[PDB]
Amino acid sequence: VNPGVVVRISQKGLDYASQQGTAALQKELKRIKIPDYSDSFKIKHLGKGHYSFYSMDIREFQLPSSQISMVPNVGLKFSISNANIKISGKWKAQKRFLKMSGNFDLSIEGMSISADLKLGSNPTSGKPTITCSSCSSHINSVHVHISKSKVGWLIQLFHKKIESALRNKMNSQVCEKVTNSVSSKLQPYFQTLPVMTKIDSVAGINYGLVAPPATTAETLDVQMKGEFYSENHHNPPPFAPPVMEFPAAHDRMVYLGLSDYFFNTAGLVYQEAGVLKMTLRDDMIPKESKFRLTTKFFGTFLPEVAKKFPNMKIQIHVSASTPPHLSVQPTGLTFYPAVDVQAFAVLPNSALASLFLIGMHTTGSMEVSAESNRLVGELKLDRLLLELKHSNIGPFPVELLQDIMNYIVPILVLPRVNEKLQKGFPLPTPARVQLYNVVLQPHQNFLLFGADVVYK
Ligand SMILES: CCCCCCCCCCCCCCCCCC(=O)OC[C@H](COP(=O)([O-])OCC[N+](C)(C)C)OC(=O)CCCCCCCCCCCCCCCCC
């Protein structure tokens, strides 16, 4: 099925992911435990004894450079190159009754760590997966700076008996940490991505992955369902999502393709739940106005109203007749709302007497922006078109209600609607990230959302 939303992370985005990762990887690397090395010796002109290098602690583990390359159709390749591991510890040697002790410094440089990241999807939950398929460290030199006392044999000893085991265990510990951090911390983090985002008492958005993440030459492509759903009653959309093929760029870190299907499912869900309705009472209009929802006022042009229903208030019911459409094109987004406006006369017992039913429809601009990690918008209308559907007070020129419709609608109706639109809809962002410096480029059948991300 064509996805309703597509997320494309660019190289700039991956570079950021790697910098945050490496930084987080440094801490785990600095917590590696290297054993104590105690062994005996017997040198031709020195004698027999027991040496010991122990109580070693990692003081600095700098990872200056890190990089994530994209291996088309395969995955990511994480690489660190000039790793510097500065270790410190103590040592003690004993020759007969001679006891010698002191601290020592060790420096491991030119360490290279390479790891393969494989991306997948979990169908039963719709969450992305990431695991480390391969890892390999590599140490170039080991500078044992016990340069403080004339004890060359001990330094010779370190290189001839200990170095070969230290490096091997260091290379294993590093890849052990990397592999673990991926499964235990990288994967669980990217699963904070919203799958079933509940936005209110009525709707929610389904951001579930509909296929495994595809790695290309220059982008990591993520396909999401992107359809507003209802929990009170499930109903599939009478349309299919468009193929969102957009220019892969590297100006921003991430790019979202928000299809028209996505936006239109919202309209369907809110309509069918019977919530796009509103009651206008005469007391909502500020007391200092020309128009009044009273039969008296309506008497100026429709009496009838004042003739059958003498001096009473008027109540108007505004409801959506059909699901509001939203068209996305390179010029901008257009909204097509159709409403049923029915006027009732409020009898002295609070009962409602149907006056007439009006069919209104218009065309407006839907502007879209982003605040925090939300998608907000604002609706603006054009001329309103009235149509008379049925009248209990006889046929009349439906054009007489134009002035009333042109006050009520933009003063009473539009305001409430824009409040929800300005509240917005949650975007598919993982935890602890905020989107800044965004660009919204309208395209044919979908909206392009580009942005930079900042990880807390
Ligand atoms: C696709 C979603 C659309 C929404 C827009 C956001 C899209 C994401 C684009 C990247 C920008 C966001 C950066 C996220 C940072 C990644 C995790 C992090 O910083 O620390 C993890 C966490 C870091 O730990 P921690 O700091 O988060 O919390 C742990 C704290 N301690 C350690 C004390 C317990 O776990 C790790 O292991 C860090 C990375 C180690 C291995 C390095 C691997 C290379 C880097 C990974 C980048 C590849 C990701 C590919 C994404 C594709 C999947 C959709």
Task: Please tell me what resolution, in angstroms, this structure has.
Answer: 2.4
Strands of 37-74 (E only): list them.
37-43, 47-62, 66-71
341 lines ligand 1 (CB under 6 A): no
Which backbone phi and psi does 264 adopt, to 5 degrees?
-70, -30
- The DSSP H or E segment spanning 187 is helix 187-190
Cβ atoms 244, 6 nearer than 8 A: yes
Among residues 318, 320, 208, which one has the least CA distance to residue 270?
A: 320
The Cα–Cα gap between 260 and 328 comes to 6
**187 CA to centre of ligand 1 in angstroms:** 8
Tell me the residue length of the chain.
Answer: 456
Among residues 131, 130, 126, which one has the least CA distance to residue 211?
A: 126
Among residues 409, 337, 408, which one has the least CA distance to residue 366?
A: 337
**219 CA to centre of ligand 1 in angstroms:** 17
The Cα–Cα gap between 346 and 352 comes to 5
Q: Which method resolved this structure? A: X-ray
Coil/strand/helix, residue 161: helix
1-11+192-456 carries CATH number 3.15.20.10? yes
Among residues 272, 317, 316, 273, which one has the least CA distance to residue 298?
A: 316
- The DSSP H or E segment spanning 375 is strand 374-381
The residue whose C-alpha atom lies closest to atom 25 belonging to ligand 1 is 24
The residue whose C-alpha atom lies closest to atom 5 belonging to ligand 1 is 429
Q: How many CB atoms lie within 10 A of CB 155?
A: 14
Cα-to-chain-centroid distance, residue 293: 46
Q: Which pair of structure tokens corresponds to residue 418? A: 């824009």
**190 CA to centre of ligand 1 in angstroms:** 7
Where are the domain boundaries for CATH 3.15.10.10 in the chain?
12-191
Tokens 């409403």 belong to 339
Q: Supply angle C-alpha 430, 431, 436, rounded to 5.
A: 75
The Cα–Cα gap between 335 and 84 comes to 59
| DSSP type of residue 123 | T
The residue whose C-alpha atom lies closest to atom 48 belonging to ligand 1 is 17
**188 CA to centre of ligand 1 in angstroms:** 9
Where are the domain boundaries for CATH 3.15.20.10 in the chain?
1-11+192-456
Burial class (CB within 10 angstroms; exposed 0-12, middle 13-18, buried 19+) of 174: buried
CATH code for the structural domain at 12-191: 3.15.10.10
